[PDB]
Amino acid sequence: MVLSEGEWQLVLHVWAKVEADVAGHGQDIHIRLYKSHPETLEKHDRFKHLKTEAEMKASEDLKKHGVTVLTALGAILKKKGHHEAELKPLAQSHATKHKIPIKYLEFISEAIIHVLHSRHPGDFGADAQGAMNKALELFRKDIAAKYKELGYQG
Numbered sequence: 001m002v003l004s005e006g007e008w009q010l011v012l013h014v015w016a017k018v019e020a021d022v023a024g025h026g027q028d029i030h031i032r033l034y035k036s037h038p039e040t041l042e043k044h045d046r047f048k049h050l051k052t053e054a055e056m057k058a059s060e061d062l063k064k065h066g067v068t069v070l071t072a073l074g075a076i077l078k079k080k081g082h083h084e085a086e087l088k089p090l091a092q093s094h095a096t097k098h099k100i101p102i103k104y105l106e107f108i109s110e111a112i113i114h115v116l117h118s119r120h121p122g123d124f125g126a127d128a129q130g131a132m133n134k135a136l137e138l139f140r141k142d143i144a145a146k147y148k149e150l151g152y153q154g
């Protein structure tokens, strides 16, 4: 699949707003991920004891991890689909070490969309939401292909 230049412009314009508060976006995204899909929290041995939204917001390690995640994703989105070298290490770790099924990447994709609409309801209208849906779908499709290249169905 492919995004137009104009869809990429909407993706990166919204990403600038994420970059104005990376840590806060990361926390909101992970809290939604873990509350709606508790099975995902189980993958994070160091976080899996956190239960309430207050406890997750108080974890300095979870806050740091949200920055790590969104920094890697931002680098990928800024490549506008030419992200092979960025995606390679991410698939390697998530498929062979952490064993994150592709389904969990759909869960976190939903959470990103929800948080972007919650924080930026004006700038994240239908056009902008459609573009970022497409960018995250391309990301999942390409990392699923790398999973299979490594021998993992995901």
Ligand code: HEM
Binding pocket: 040, 041, 043, 044, 045, 046, 065, 068, 069, 070, 072, 073, 089, 090, 093, 094, 098, 100, 104, 105, 108
């Ligand atoms: C946008 C999607 C994602 C991005 C960009 C991302 C990015 C990263 C990065 C940069 C790291 C540190 C280096 C590495 O181990 O590769 C990491 C680690 C990790 N990720 Fe992800 N990740 C994503 C989705 C997920 C999901 C949905 C899970 C579900 C639990 C997950 C579980 C983990 C785990 C278990 C680690 C090891 C660190 C730890 O145990 O706290 N990842 N991720």
Ligand SMILES: [Cl-]
Binding pocket: 102, 106, 137, 140, 141
């Ligand atoms: Cl998918």
